[PDB]
Amino acid sequence: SRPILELKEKIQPEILELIKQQRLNRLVEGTCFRKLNARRRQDKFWYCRLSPNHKVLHYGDLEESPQGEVPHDSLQDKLPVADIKAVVTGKDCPHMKEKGALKQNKEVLELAFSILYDSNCQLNFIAPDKHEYCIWTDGLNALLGKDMMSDLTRNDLDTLLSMEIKLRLLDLENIQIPDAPPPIPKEPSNYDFVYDCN
């Protein structure tokens, strides 16, 4: 399968592309995110929609919406990407370094992500579980145009690559691909087509 694997893993471009596209769609659709330590009647649900323009983030101190996102220009409708330095994830989050009343507990370490914008104010966020957290940071890295850091993302990429190479190889069944590609037959150096083109 060595030539087959060469052929397969050489034509990547579109697979990670589509996975990142899906991540982007996930951020655009968005859902109710969690604030910090939503305890004293604080909204553990509030939405953050990536723009239809993909230029603003519809994040705002919205209420406990079990449905999910409510569509409007949120309490903080703007989050341009031109200034998004990064997102601190895990212990790197300032909300994970808080030792005051907002001290995030030990059950939010993987729910730790705060978008770096303005270099001082971080969208100190908490996730409902690991997978959507990884997807959020994935899509944000897609806004940064970098790699996807969900384990399930690499799952999707490998399985799509395997299925795709599976769904191409049909015709060369009963035939082999030499590791060195079979010799290109010497074309007639004259471009002369005795019968017309097409």
Binding site: N53, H54, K55, V56, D73, D77, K78, P80
Partner: protein, 380 residues
């Protein structure tokens, strides 16, 4: 809009054409009855739309039609009671003035209508231009603008990657008909300072002259950015294009004129708003008078003396110096205006204002005699 529809209708006694016979409900529907429905809803709108001027302006001929055809005497009376309600709302209730913006969407990236044309926008009553441009960034992709606030962005006249440009333009005054001769109370003006507005302008401070440090005044020029809106503000659409834009210019004399004019108009403004008011803080009086008594940051008294009143500016302008005498007139009516300021201060004068009013009387009569001699005014 509903009116525009009713505008098509006539008070005729009959159901005339079924085209206007709407599909929400349908029976005989004689024209005057339809206008009656429409006018009911229109007046309801205006009542909840706060535009009771329109409410009354229609209710008049509404009752006219009542009596003239139908004798809806019950409707006559209730309609007129509502008219009374509207008038009371007018005199009593006060209304805020929305900030106004002539908006240039620049970029071939905008649609054909959305590109390179100055759309005058009726914002909200108290809009900050920054939040306005913010929602434009919400409005459009490519959240970036021109710092070319005054001039157009020619590159982004035909470039993609839409740019923008905005600012709070001047709401040009309304024209209260037959009220200019009339000492009308304020309610008409407050209702007119930001509504029924089609002309607009934004400020263009400019430095055309000798930019010496103390004087900003022989250089200060305002290239007023005159606008005409195609349609009334308010109107069928909040925003609108500029129907016609015009730049302007303002000479060092004319800009001295306007500085002292805004000075005096704000003096008169605070004085008069205090005059008919009684539940007013005297802090603004302290503001005005404490600022006036000291031509402090720069001696605007002395600044105008040097810039225009003195001989050097006769050197700049011998023939057309008959406006620095007009600056003398401006101050010479300012200090009687400052005198009504003194009056309102004194009638609302307190213990900590007492040293303040001491300085008021003292230095103010000082500037009085000073303009009578040094500034060369011929007072009243």
């Amino acid at each position: 809009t509903l009116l525009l529809h009713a505008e098509l209708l006539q008070w005729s006694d009959k159901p005339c054409v079924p085209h206007l016979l709407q599909r929400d409900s349908y029976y005989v529907y004689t024209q005057q009855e339809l206008k009656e429905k429409l006018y009911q809803e229109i007046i309801s709108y205006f009542d909840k739309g706060k535009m009771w001027e329109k409410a009354i302006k229609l209710s008049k001929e509404l009752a006219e039609t009542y009596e003239s055809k139908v004798f809806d005497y019950e409707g006559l009376g209730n309609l007129l009671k509502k008219r009374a309600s509207f008038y009371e709302n007018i005199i009593k209730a006060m209304r805020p003035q929305p900030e106004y913006f002539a908006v240039g969407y620049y970029g071939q990236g905008f649609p054909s209508f959305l590109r390179n044309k100055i759309f005058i926008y009726r914002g909200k009553e108290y809009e900050r231009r920054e939040d306005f441009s913010l929602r434009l960034l919400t409005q459009f992709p490519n959240a970036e603008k021109m710092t070319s606030t005054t001039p157009p962005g020619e590159d982004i006249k035909s470039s993609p990657k839409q740019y923008m440009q905005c600012f709070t333009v001047k709401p040009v005054m309304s024209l209260p008909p037959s009220y200019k001769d009339k000492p009308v109370p304020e309610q008409i003006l407050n209702y007119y300072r930001a509504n029924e507005v089609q002309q607009f302008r934004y400020s263009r401070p400019f430095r055309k002259g000798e930019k010496d440090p103390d004087n900003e005044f022989a250089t200060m020029w305002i290239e007023r950015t005159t606008y005409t809106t195609a349609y009334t503000f308010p109107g069928i659409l909040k925003w609108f294009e500029v129907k016609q834009i015009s730049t302007e210019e303002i000479s060092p004399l004319e800009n001295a004129i306007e500085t002292m004019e805004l000075t005096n108009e704000r003096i008169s403004n605070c004085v008069q708003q205090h005059a008919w008011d009684r539940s007013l803080s005297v802090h603004p009086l302290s503001m005005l008078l404490s600022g006036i008594v000291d031509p402090a940051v720069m001696g605007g008294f002395s600044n105008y003396e040097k810039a225009f009143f003195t001989e050097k500016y006769l050197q700049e302008h011998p023939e057309d110096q008959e406006k620095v005498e007009l600056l003398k007139r401006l101050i010479a009516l300012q200090m009687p205006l400052l005198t009504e300021g003194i009056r309102i201060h004194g009638e609302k004068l307190t213990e900590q204002l007492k040293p303040l009013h001491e300085r008021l009387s003292s230095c103010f009569r000082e500037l009085k005699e000073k303009v009578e001699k040094h500034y060369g005014v011929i007072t009243l």
